[PDB]
Design an enzyme around this catalytic site. Structure first.
Site, mmCIF file in Angstrom:
data_model
loop_
_atom_site.group_PDB
_atom_site.id
_atom_site.type_symbol
_atom_site.label_atom_id
_atom_site.label_comp_id
_atom_site.label_asym_id
_atom_site.label_seq_id
_atom_site.Cartn_x
_atom_site.Cartn_y
_atom_site.Cartn_z
ATOM 1 N N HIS A 35 0.838 -1.186 0.000
ATOM 2 C CA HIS A 35 0.000 0.000 0.000
ATOM 3 C C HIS A 35 0.881 1.247 0.000
ATOM 4 C CE1 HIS A 35 -3.846 -1.984 0.203
ATOM 5 N NE2 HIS A 35 -3.430 -2.740 1.202
ATOM 6 N N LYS B 244 -3.142 10.872 2.167
ATOM 7 C CA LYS B 244 -2.043 10.515 1.271
ATOM 8 C C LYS B 244 -2.392 10.833 -0.186
ATOM 9 C CE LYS B 244 -2.437 6.440 2.772
ATOM 10 N NZ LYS B 244 -2.462 4.969 3.025
ATOM 11 N N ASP C 289 -2.477 3.540 -3.700
ATOM 12 C CA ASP C 289 -3.002 2.396 -2.950
ATOM 13 C C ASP C 289 -2.523 1.020 -3.404
ATOM 14 O OD1 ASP C 289 -6.175 0.932 -2.068
ATOM 15 O OD2 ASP C 289 -4.503 1.444 -0.758
ATOM 16 N N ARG D 218 14.823 17.447 17.082
ATOM 17 C CA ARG D 218 15.238 18.789 16.718
ATOM 18 C C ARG D 218 16.515 18.769 15.874
ATOM 19 N NH1 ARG D 218 15.282 23.979 17.885
ATOM 20 N NH2 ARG D 218 17.198 25.160 18.349
#
Lengths: 306, 300, 304, 310, 303, 304
Positions: F139, F160, F178, F241
């Site tokens: 997928h 998505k 997909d 970070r």
């Protein structure tokens, strides 16, 4: 022109028109526009074949209601024997009994509605009238820019087409190139592509391209209200001097409708597509009641004060 | 030039300045910049009218402190009679008692502040001076591109105006056209449209258009710090310069040519300008690379 | 703060200045702003070490212009005696001969200029003063949008930074994130990035990135005049105005700035709401209030 | 409804209409639509006032041409007596002398044209009629995207205005928000902003903003022909395999006109404006004959066939 | 041609190789592309200097893993003697006993690969062969538009370079300007910037610009497969597009287009249009043919 | 594998490959990948059946030209009796006369080519190996952004697909949604849409759309080399970070650069995807923002 059949009217207004008689002649051709008032025919003064859809509303019903059933029959016979394409009864025509009686023989398509004469004027009627609107073929390129229908003219020819390609890349709507046609509806002028043109367009070095297959249906439109005319002037405009203060507004009449006129020069170094956009912006702005030039002059005076 | 008034100053510095006297004379005009120092006239040497805002701070409060109340009055008298637009009292001048008493005669606007003389130099004082900055009129197009003020010049008025519109469609800021003017502030050069120019600009086929009403305020800007100058003609290892009204602006000269839009070139010039200013010179890099290749040909 | 040496001043105004002494001490560090008038010291009343550039114009001239040579000599010495970092002489101070001699023994770098006292106020003096302006470190994100300095706040965390990246993608100028500083100049407020931040910015999932290397110098700016402040609010419960005629302000380091509070909402682009606020700020500033126009219009219709 | 004046009418058609009498009354108000045939009143059968523009064409000119002077003056007086706002003469009405004479007193505005009644049907008459079209106020947002008039509905006014602003930033045309009205013209449905709405829009955090002043005339339009209707749902409530695929286009009738219907949920992780754009493109493609869903299914069949063909 | 030293390979696939024995001849060059088998060399049948990276796999191993010890040295000697640049060993080899032995007097570099004979076709083999490709220097602009390698040709200074700039701002990729080079790999033509050109570009009125530092590393690409050629003409053309033109180049026929540069018009957009047209025609759609079938279909008005 | 036949290899290179013998056994099955070298077998030292396509180049032909006719046939008989699925002749093998005479009985498919040994590695070998590669269905969303193959993973319904749409309008390329499939080739990974999916995409509340017909064939691509993986997440959380190194994740045996990004409301996800690619390309060129940030901070502290 394409023939307007009675069934076409039915299908197109199945929401406010109901066929209650003459079901078999729904194929009749409507050969004349408008919703024909036929008092002359009813009073036996005129007797020419009727080619438009006839209408019986409040007035006709009130007149008939004060007559005897026999008289009404004579009156309605004068109408039906003239072979109208169809007959439409407004909500004011409450009892169509006598009509259907007289119509048993003729079987003229009878259409019932719950609209008043006034409501049918800007609906069923307006529809019929536009089918007969005069349409003319002309040359040029049509696009809708900023929701404003623009007709691109000039002499370059393919130059105009390439310019429409520029506007297309700027997400404006393309209607048609070269083989276009216009028509006046009310006080508005409309343009669309002829069948031969559709959405094809010739670009030097590429030939005939299909604008829709290239950039999708999001950049085309079936028609547009033409309100602006832009004339592209070639490098040999040096006979033209350009307006310093466009205080006024030049116009040009096409098929009866006056169109604002702009004359733009093709200049190396800048984008032509965007000078056209500015013209349209000029137009919409002036239409809203703002003139740059005028405002400029008022600014000069305001500053001038010893 | 537009009148600078005591009220303007007050209204403009409400956060750190308060009027404590001369309330009815805030209508006084300021004819001279800077927070004027009045030691000469205080001691009574100069007798010419003061056309600027006088300042009294630490150096003056201590001086008068060691003086008799009679002497203190004589001094403040020599000043207030010179007819100054106003007088600001620093956080140093902690006691206007004598001053106020002597001033109830002339009623000169007396402003009090919690700032020191040094803190007023880059605030109140700098605000006043800017107002008297010398301004000059010039020709060309003023725009801000990628945050860089750009002065467009050239013989062709069409070349400039057209390039400008294209730049506007690129969402660059339009400051003014043709009738523009400049002034200097410190080591920076500023530009803006004259009053007769506002945001209007002539364009063949359309005449004069109001750029602002045509494309919105997100497209215009009141003023811009001119840092770059580009001349339009109808390698690049060096960053050519040119001085204007005492300031050095970077200079570029480009030819308007068919086959390319002038606007994209201006954009490239500006990026080049910023890059070079950061230490990166394309032409040199190209040279160094070409050089390293030859030193690699030393294999044979 | 960074030192303002006399040399720096000269090199910065080489178009209207001209050094003529103290060549060895052009490295004289200036510790005090303003073109300090020294009349008090010229009379011995005040005698403390000068820490700022000194000036002598038409006024200071006429005084010495009619004093006997020993007056000049004695007065002029009490000045240099204090050791002034430098001494500029206006155009009106014609013939510094007497001053040249007395200084011929002093290591005082004197600068000559062809500018009058007035013209120097908004030039040389402005430059010096600005160097000493007060600076303050604060948090937030700085950008310039549509030519307008914008300060993003709202303690929305890195959400602000993420919203700045959105603005940068619309071609607005980035100035600094998180480690920023502001300074007041005149009646205007300015913002810039602290040396540690420069053009770095933390973005969730990418950590600290260099926007300048990512999108080029065309999307950065060293400083901006801050005029608007937008506070972003996270989904966490308020009620928003219906008209918005108000247009509130917020004072920062002495400067009043317009204040906007916008909500972060799903299915919509936050960058555009911010852009809209800037447009609103600029229209109103020009004299156009949407709310007020809406009401006037609503009133006219009723008056029928 | 804005008052329709005779002089306004003459302006929109200075190309085919010439005022020939009743000049001082050109300020007459046209209260009723349509080019009225006044046979009943000419024959003295009806006697109610007239609020619409009456027409005299071939038919009427011939009927009158049969009568004597006194008879025509009789008939003409009956008409003018009902106080019509104006009267238009077709090209077939060749001699207006008698009328002009009888009208020396009433001074009703007489309009002359070289158009035939049929040519007036889609020009002068169409213009007039459309001015009286029935208008209904409704709630929603109107825009024109990819040249297609789109009506946005939903309970969430916030979700609607925000979508609008996003579409505006996409250069689509804004017509009006919240306080809108639709009117039917022919077999087409139109929409525009009410006078109270204009181009004003409420956006949280800002209040009321004037879309036109903010983003320019480039993104506004007075009216649009509504063809698509998209209802935005707050929650994402779900089932038939062919229905979730979009095999056939759903519809909805509004003011008698059938509009293509779409229903989409507002959802984080995607901008609503993007889904609207896609719906419009989908609407156009399916209208041009291309159906993604059906094509997707054909692709399966084609694949399955070859897989089933050795 | 930049000599291909064995070392460059070591630092090219060090995640799969492991230099052992003979670290003195790593400064040796590769005169021949490919991974040659030396079965002829081993048996002495072939007596010519090896110019390419040899290889001893499973096959050549079991062949010696049965031969006498006097023969293994009588074969490994006939190979290393010809002075092969390198000797890559596959996993299905191991036990370089006699190998490292006789190599004590040759000290030829040898490596070990976790890959097998089959995993060397699309790795070591391919990489090496590209180095030896026959590159030809030409003049033009290289870009990748909508995934398609495009070669922009035309007279010097007419807009080509600026055109690429516009393309780049629509997120298309820039390979090189003016000083470019091409070469054929199999049946496809590829293009890259000459070492001297890099991503530098010359803009009249400005000079040399570094597209990378100007508009970003993301819009630059090192290589591209050229499939389309567009010749830009300075200040006639076909009105139809039924006949798709082509133009041979280095043995590769590319789709050919030729368009005029016209003032006011954005050249970049015509370049994109040609690509769309290009992709469209290859998918089965021809605007010209459709336009004709439309006129004919309409010409059916004789009924 | 779907079983690879010689006629399929012939069909694939109709231009540069001609069949000149063994035309009735074009149904031979290629049981083994890669173009096999057969010098050993030619010399009769090996005698095992050949299951891969054999090759004869400049070396083999050059060897035969020096041997006698009787010897050439003997050598060829040794090769041919091992029943290789087929034999490909390079451009250097200019004379197949003797080979054909001997192959008169075995009738092994013989392919004359215009390619040289070095060229075959890019053409025929690559194809063969591609046909032998393992294809896994998975997928996700496949796009090529700034020329880099990107695999977007995550839970369904987070956005998505819609993201691919904003990317596409930025002119990036869409490969599949997909129902996708991937396959490895050496140390590189490839992906494409599954035949049942092609360029179709499902958009909630809209249904199935066809990207090609909606936004143009130009912005769609068949295959792409996946180089980075991006997993988008929905929140209701502190991210790294610094990130001094490029994280990685193994997919079908290939380590891809891995990014983990949140789908933040109001922000355009598509642009965060573009940042990752830019970040990816930058680091591969030797530039790491965090590291540059770290050094910048040290230097500042060092200036103490």
């Amino acid at each position: 022109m394409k023939k307007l059949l009675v069934k076409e009217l039915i299908e197109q207004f199945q929401d406010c028109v109901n066929l209650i008689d003459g079901h078999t002649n729904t194929s009749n051709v409507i050969r004349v526009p408008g919703l024909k008032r036929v008092v002359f025919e009813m009073l036996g003064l005129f007797s020419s074949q009727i080619g438009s859809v006839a209408i019986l509303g409040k007035r006709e019903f009130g007149f008939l209601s004060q007559k005897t059933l026999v008289e009404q029959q004579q009156i309605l016979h004068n109408l039906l024997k003239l072979n109208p394409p169809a007959i439409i009864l407004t909500k004011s025509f409450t009892d169509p009994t006598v009509l259907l009686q007289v119509n048993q023989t003729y079987q003229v398509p009878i259409l019932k509605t719950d609209f008043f004469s006034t409501e049918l004027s800007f609906t069923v009627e307006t529809y019929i009238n536009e089918q007969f609107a005069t349409v003319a073929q002309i040359h040029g390129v049509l696009l809708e820019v900023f929701g404003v229908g623009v007709l691109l003219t000039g002499r370059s020819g393919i130059g105009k087409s390439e310019c429409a390609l520029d506007l297309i890349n700027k997400n404006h709507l393309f209607v048609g190139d070269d083989a276009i046609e216009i028509y006046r509806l009310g006080n508005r002028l409309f343009g669309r592509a002829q069948e031969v043109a559709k959405k094809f367009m010739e670009i030097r070095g590429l030939g005939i391209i299909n604008v829709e297959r290239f950039y999708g249906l999001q950049i085309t439109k079936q028609r547009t209200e033409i309100q602006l005319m832009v004339n592209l002037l070639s490098l040999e405009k040096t006979t033209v001097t350009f307006e310093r203060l466009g205080t006024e507004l030049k116009k040009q009449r096409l098929l009866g409708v006056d169109l604002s006129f702009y004359e733009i020069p093709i200049s190396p170094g800048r984008k032509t597509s965007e000078i056209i956009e500015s013209a349209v912006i000029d137009f919409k702005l002036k239409h809203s009641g703002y003139n740059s030039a005028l405002d400029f002059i008022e600014n000069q005076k305001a500053i001038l004060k010893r």
